[PDB]
Design a protein around this ligand. Structure first.
Ligand SMILES: CC(C)[C@H](NC(=O)C(F)(F)F)C(=O)N[C@@H](C)C(=O)Nc1ccc(C(F)(F)F)cc1
Ligand SMILES: [Ca+2]
Length: 240
């Protein structure tokens, strides 16, 4: 997150760290939202290489034991059948990961509240992006969880000339674009939490930023609109 601030420890307890293996060690590659005690929602582009992944729940500082972390293997990845690696701008950037075991819930590990199908937020709706990705364009990973208030830019403004144009589809949520705050690499697959009737629910799965850098004026961060995928989500958990 560029222009963010650090988060409280138990602030966003459905945030996870999606890590892959490097040698004996593990590196954070993406975020994700715990949706079931054995299922994580993340972006499909995060599991496009055939890596060994793991999930870390209850995480706050990546480089230091917090006393709160649970670490579980990824047993099965079900990415969206229409996802195409060569074209994020087509949309469908979503994947579900079956964990090897059920994580234990406590005040650090909670399930993410998903929106109702079809739900579209109004322009300038209050949302927060969370993640351990780059703090500057071409910078480095945050070691503690960061957060920025990232208000939505609705579809009509996001797909106008001046912003993302045709690159953004209606199955996507835009948020930010002020030139100060954004999501950035390593935040991919993470949540956009938006307050809806006194409940923060996960309306976005971070998908992409501009090629000229993370915090770019009028290129808001682009998220997969979770509410366009509620039936496929539900139909995958009932299958597996
Ligand atoms: C999509 C992810 C690999 C990568 N995502 C992120 O950085 C994220 F964290 F914001 F989600 C990304 O946007 N990286 C930038 C550097 C990039 O490649 N952006 C990009 C934007 C649009 C398009 C296009 F037009 F094809 F859709 C292609 C690449
Ligand atoms: Ca830690």
């Amino acid at each position: 997150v560029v222009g963010g601030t650090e988060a409280q420890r138990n602030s966003w307890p459905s945030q996870i760290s999606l890590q892959y293996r490097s040698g004996s060690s593990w590196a954070h590659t993406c975020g994700g939202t715990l949706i079931r005690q054995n299922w994580v929602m993340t972006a499909a582009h995060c599991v496009d290489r055939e890596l060994t992944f793991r999930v870390v729940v209850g995480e706050h500082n990546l480089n230091q034991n917090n006393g709160t972390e649970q670490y579980v293997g990824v047993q099965k990845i079900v990415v969206h059948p229409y996802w195409n690696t060569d074209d994020v701008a087509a949309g469908y950037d979503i994947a579900l990961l079956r964990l090897a075991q059920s994580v234990t819930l406590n005040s650090y590990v909670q399930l993410g509240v998903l929106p109702r199908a079809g739900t579209i937020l109004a322009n300038n709706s209050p949302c927060y992006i969370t993640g351990w990705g780059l703090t500057r364009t071409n910078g480095q990973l945050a070691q503690t969880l960061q957060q920025a208030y990232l208000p939505t830019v609705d579809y009509a403004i996001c797909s106008s000339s001046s912003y993302w144009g045709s690159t953004v589809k209606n199955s996507m949520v835009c948020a930010g674009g002020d030139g100060v705050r954004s999501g950035c690499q390593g935040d991919s697959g993470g949540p956009l939490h938006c307050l809806v009737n006194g409940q923060y629910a996960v309306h976005g799965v971070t998908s992409f930023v501009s090629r000229l850098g993370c915090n770019v004026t009028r290129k808001p961060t682009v998220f997969t609109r979770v509410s366009a995928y509620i039936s496929w989500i539900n139909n995958v958990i009932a299958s597996n």
